[PDB]
Design a protein around this ligand. Sequence first.
Ligand code: CA
Ligand code: CL
Ligand code: CL
Length: 294
Amino acid sequence: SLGAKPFGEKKFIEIKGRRMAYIDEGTGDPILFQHGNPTSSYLWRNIMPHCAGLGRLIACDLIGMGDSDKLDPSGPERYTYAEHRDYLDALWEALDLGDRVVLVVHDWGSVLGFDWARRHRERVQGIAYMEAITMPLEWADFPEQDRDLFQAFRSQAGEELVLQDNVFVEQVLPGLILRPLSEAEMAAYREPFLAAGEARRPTLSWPRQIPIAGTPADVVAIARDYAGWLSESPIPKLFINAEPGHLTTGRIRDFCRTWPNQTEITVAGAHFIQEDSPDEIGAAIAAFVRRLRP
Ligand SMILES: [Ca+2]
Ligand SMILES: [Cl-]
Ligand SMILES: [Cl-]
């Protein structure tokens, strides 16, 4: 159902000198849920219950997000994709995931998850994705309504928008959810970002890292690599399409629809579709996992 209560209890682990927070419930092969910007493990709270008893249910808070530690010192060159990947790779290693991992990804969680999967293909049993970066982007893929704002994030205006005014949390997040959020839900999303300044850096560094029109070149290359791989991989996939959807529409949806061994369902939502259709999403993931684990 819907609801503002988190799933499970937050656990903590030291990774590269910083404390990272994660949810880890149950036993067996992992079903690994990865949030992106500007969210946390909290995004999956109404979805994870649908997988009860199908394996070890894991949702990690990316560095500087959720209940994970902030980088110290924080600044404009921190919280790059490469930096997030170093922490997340190390956390996933520390969690002893084994070699039959199901990945469930969204937003920046998909760039991280798709890349990790490409680098650890023998260990990936299935990939479920939604509102994901399925390939390097162009401004034409960006919904027209968001072009100017994201271009502004990727300019000197970004610091005032995000660090001073918390625009990603306070404007973009609810703007891309169809149903109204409760007070408790917004409180959970804003909690890691209550303080103005560097506490909010992850939510600005992320849009600056989106592979668009060839920049940044490193992230473009990573996305190009996993795009090629996924388009040829026989790993079972679940594509949760959204209507109206947001990011994964047009050209980049045309592209991910070419991926082999893929089941697709459509649910109601814009970008943060987990807040609109958690039960339909969880039910689909559960059925996917049951077929993977008979
Ligand atoms: Ca809304
Ligand atoms: Cl096993
Ligand atoms: Cl972003």
